[PDB]
Symmetry: D2
């Protein structure tokens, strides 16, 4: 049986309580619980996610550890997952798991989600696939998966990219391998860091205010992710705001509020384009990109390859 470490951070899903709640896991692998933190995912911060990554990195460096399952809240799991997706230098399975219903709710999804997460983490076939998010019988890539519904069990989906695999009848069915750089082939090393560049997200909508750009600039942001209307389209007020941000060394990354798709290059508009990264994912990559460079051309390439 593979050795799996379950790191708890909090979420609707103690760590031992969860382990004892589902004895079935012992039959899938030798599990050791570790309470990393205990907070709702809406409060997870880059600084803490950074420590999480460094901790997972040292655990995976150990010969006595074959994989890691991280319990996390559903609200921002896509952000934490994508962060480790880009910073964990190992092929060993790193599986995030969450639950849309509280552990006390009728028909709670937590028990089964955890069981599936451990099976995925302990399977030899799961190595070298990037960070994964397991829930509701699905295995989603950290780079594509996102919470699409505020309250449903089947909320996590990658509409255009699908799932890396699924777990049915206690068997794992791998469907895709992501065609992007990650983990062991990522240039983003943060083990020598304690914090990341500040990046905020501004929404795009009719009558969007120019002053929010001023406010962000004034508070020291090093980057601004724009959840734009359509394909990163910008109103005259957003353009004026982005212009001021650029004049002050702030990197502007145009994403989309739509939820899916490609924001294509447009030399007629200011800032960079987010490829298929949604706002939450784009912020994470921009923060990491800024730890290595400020060159817009280099940053743009990162977004087309990560």
């Amino acid at each position: 049986l593979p050795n799996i470490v379950i790191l708890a951070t909090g979420g609707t899903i103690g760590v031992d309580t969860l382990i004892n709640a589902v004895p079935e896991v012992k039959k899938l692998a030798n599990v050791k619980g570790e309470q990393f933190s205990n907070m709702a995912s809406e409060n997870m911060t880059g600084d803490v996610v950074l420590k999480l990554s460094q901790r997972v990195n040292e655990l995976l460096a150990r010969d006595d550890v074959d994989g890691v399952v991280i319990t996390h809240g559903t609200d921002t799991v896509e952000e934490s997952a994508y962060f480790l997706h880009l910073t964990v230098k190992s092929d060993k399975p790193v599986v995030f798991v969450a639950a849309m219903r509280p552990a006390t709710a009728i028909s709670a999804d937590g028990p089964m989600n955890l069981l599936e997460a451990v099976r995925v983490a302990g399977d030899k076939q799961s190595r070298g696939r990037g960070v994964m998010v397991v829930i509701n019988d699905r295995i989603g890539s950290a780079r594509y998966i996102t919470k699409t519904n505020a309250s449903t069990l089947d909320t996590f989906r990658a509409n255009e990219e699908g799932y890396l695999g699924v777990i049915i009848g206690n068997r794992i069915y791998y469907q895709n391998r992501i065609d992007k750089l990650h983990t062991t082939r990522s240039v983003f090393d943060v083990r020598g860091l304690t914090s990341l560049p500040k990046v905020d997200i501004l929404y795009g909508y009719q009558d969007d205010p120019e002053y929010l750009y001023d406010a962000a600039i004034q508070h020291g942001v090093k980057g601004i992710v724009y959840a734009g209307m359509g394909a990163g389209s910008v109103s005259v007020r957003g353009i004026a705001g982005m212009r001021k941000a650029l004049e002050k060394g702030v990197v502007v990354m145009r994403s989309t509020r739509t939820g899916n798709g490609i924001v294509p290059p447009d030399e007629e508009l200011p800032g960079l384009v987010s490829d298929s990264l949604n706002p939450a994912h784009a912020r994470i990559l921009l923060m990491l990109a800024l730890t290595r460079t400020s060159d817009p051309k280099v940053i743009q390439e990162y977004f087309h390859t990560y």
Copy 2:
């Protein structure tokens, strides 16, 4: 044939005048007596509430006439869901109001605008289309302004209502109506906007890890009357967000918690500040909050609005 007025506002569907737009698809003249009218000309990302308000009042006027059976409005795809929903709540008529757009420029290979326009006119002129609320027609689909939204930045099939589906579809030049929205709208709406020239200011703040409290301060300091929160999950709020919302609530600003996810219900939660957006996404929530603010500041009333419109 039914008398249909085509109001052009701009958009990729003409990326060109409304007349050149009609001549490009002569087939529409076989479906109805169309009258072209250039209301405005701008990319939808630049469409503003004051202009949308004027658009609604203009449509109200036209539909009040006996020589007008319906209206088709060409519009950019980026914010058509905002404009469409605005009229959904403000146009007091059962006559069809159909927004139409195109994801590909009119000059592009396999441009979708031509067929989209033809379908929109067919829908607007069909007597079976009455009393269904404002509609958005594109890619053979008919979506309700209250549910439809642009879900993809660049695909032809971008407009979808994942949980609510389409009101109907157009296949083989025939309309197939599937649903009737179970919400108040148009002739049943209390949102009278006759005579108005401006609307309360409402901003949308995003929710994410490390989300800053200063954005709330900035919005509050600039006189917004309401703040729509595109929150994490079911409108979940961080400590910074909670602090920010409290300041807003103290200054008398209405806080509406929506979601950044893209779909779903943000349920009530007395342990959290502000109101909840029901199934309205951030963009639609802002539109309804603005209109709600023209009639009341009472959190109770505004909340009921969000559960019924």
Copy 3:
């Protein structure tokens, strides 16, 4: 508290009393009474049995002491049973089918929550006159549109193009749509005095599809054939020869699609009728019922565009 009768037919969700005592939370949403109509895997549910279920439900709903019904059923053919009652239950009182994708003994079994939501929906006055519904995974689907789209997932039931009538979140019902089709109280499909149903089979459309299967169906007395066609009910040279032989022998031919969604449009250059947006399973149910009233192609075709 509304009076809700729970009729069990079988299914992974679970006899009926065990189901009720298993989820006591239901008795807080209504005054429940269980009835074991039958017990079999839904793949074995038959038209004759569904017919009797519909008659029993009508009988039950005609009573003043019954406000609604919840029917537990297997997920495999619930769309067929639900649509049948959608067309035959002459009452506006809620009829809610409920099922479960995971066995009642599995960890994170979905059955308990599904049942609770089904009872809440069945007992809400706001749920009247919406046609037969299928409740599962926090969603409320119309029997006419809902279908099992996935072999094994919890979220399998979906109506891709038509969406859900509503959803249940945080113990609250959110109604989104009202189906724009005829059903229940406004349906002509009264089967009160029926004991049998016209034989209707489904033949698949694919490359190299055999004409002999049409011959076989004809030889075995089918009164109608539903074609789960390639694309928009497209037919190969072998399928068209088979359909023509069927038509020559008095069989009603209905062209549907194997795709899973969408409209099979009228086509004057192809034999048979078209199924509108009804999938093969639904199309068979409506065709069977239609045949109890007429053999008139024009009438049957109009049924398919309105029901």
Copy 4:
């Protein structure tokens, strides 16, 4: 420029033969040096295994040439998923094989054929497109032959792989590769069909309430070597279906249980007759079963093929 051969199997999907197609969309000549070949001319609902076999053999032949960098095959939408998956399993080359189709006729308003072809050629000539298995390009999407399927009878966006997504997309004239299928295909496939002129006969029977046992009897009587069952739910079988399958197995017929639902895994179950189709839908399952039968009749081996191809 890359050298692309466009093989047509039916009518042109653009303008008003393969020559008409190319002359109708001259933009392709800027993406590659194209050469057209009229392989066949029939509606896809009439495409047969014998013909698809020749198609595969012809493609293998073309791809073995130095002067051919890739091939684009125009095909009807109705059965393109079947033809594409067959070549996906029998073309022994890593060079791109791109099936393209159109949901609207070439002479229709806003016909999709022109743009679809343009995207297909761009994909077929891109160095980055090698070794990805057979692809189906349409409506800005690149789908794997193993997962993609026509999900809607009449819409432009009909082709989707709900659980597996697209291999990539084409937006703004640029290809964005998202996934690589984790299954065996093309150069790693054991399905050698050179020399063959016909394929084992395989029929598909539907699963539904009251499904008849006599249909299994008929198939058996007509010498089918395999039966694909489009089962209720996860390949569930009624008492009649079980009786039918038992008879088939007694006659040496291989029974493969798939699902009529449209998506998902049909899991193994010892209490039921036959094999399970993994995530292959009926149409795909039939194709793989026919090819599996050209190698063996052993159930364990065929079952392994279904879990790896």
